């Protein structure tokens, strides 16, 4: 049992589950585009804030 | 009566007391290799020592 527990320990992964890499890259690309568009809108408002300042 | 008493005095049908087990004192290397599993293995060891 100790042998099997060690083989299972070394062969186990960092994660406890099997991530679906396609859906994760999908959410990553969507969230990336939403973040770039958010930063562009914030720069657009910062222009008016450094004008009022 | 002496012979009868001597024969009766011992329980051949029973099992003798095995020597006692001191504390485990598991090593840091084995613990680092198997943090959470030694407890389950020790429980299974108790289960097998009682039943099996």
Q: How far is B17 from chain A (nearest CA, A)?
A: 26
Kindly list the distances between the CA atom of residue A44 and the CA atoms of A30, A41, A48, A50, A52, in Å, as whole numbers in the listed order. 21, 5, 7, 11, 13
d(CA A45, CA A51): 10
Q: Do A5 and B44 touch (CB under 8 A)?
A: no
What are phi and psi for residue B35, nearest 5 degrees? Answer: -60, -60
Angle at the Cα of B22 from the Cα atoms of A3 and B50, rounded to 5 degrees: 65
Kindly list the distances between the CA atom of residue A23 and the CA atoms of A9, A17, A28, B47, in Å, as whole numbers in the listed order. 28, 14, 8, 45
* Residue of chain B whose Cα is closest to the Cα of A8: B34
Q: What is the largest CA-CA distance in chain A?
A: 72
Sketch the domain layout of chain B as residue ranges: 10-52
Chain B environment of A9 (Cβ under 8 Å): 33-34, 37
Whether the CB of B44 is below 8 Å from some CB of chain A: the reply is: yes
Is the distance from CB of B34 to CB of A6 less than 8 angstroms? yes
Residues near B30 by Cβ (< 8 Å), separated by ≥ 6? A2, B38
């Amino acid at each position: 049992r100790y042998l099997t527990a060690l083989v299972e320990a070394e062969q186990a992964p960092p994660l406890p589950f099997t991530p679906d890499v396609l859906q994760l890259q999908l959410e990553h690309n969507v969230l990336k585009g939403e973040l770039i568009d958010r930063l562009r809108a914030l720069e657009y408002t910062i222009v008016t804030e450094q004008l009022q300042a | 009566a002496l012979a009868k008493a001597s024969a009766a005095q011992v329980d051949w049908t029973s099992l003798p007391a095995a020597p006692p087990r001191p504390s485990p004192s598991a090593p840091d290397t084995l613990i680092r290799l198997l943090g959470s599993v030694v407890d389950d293995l020790a429980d299974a060891d108790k289960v097998e020592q009682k039943y099996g």
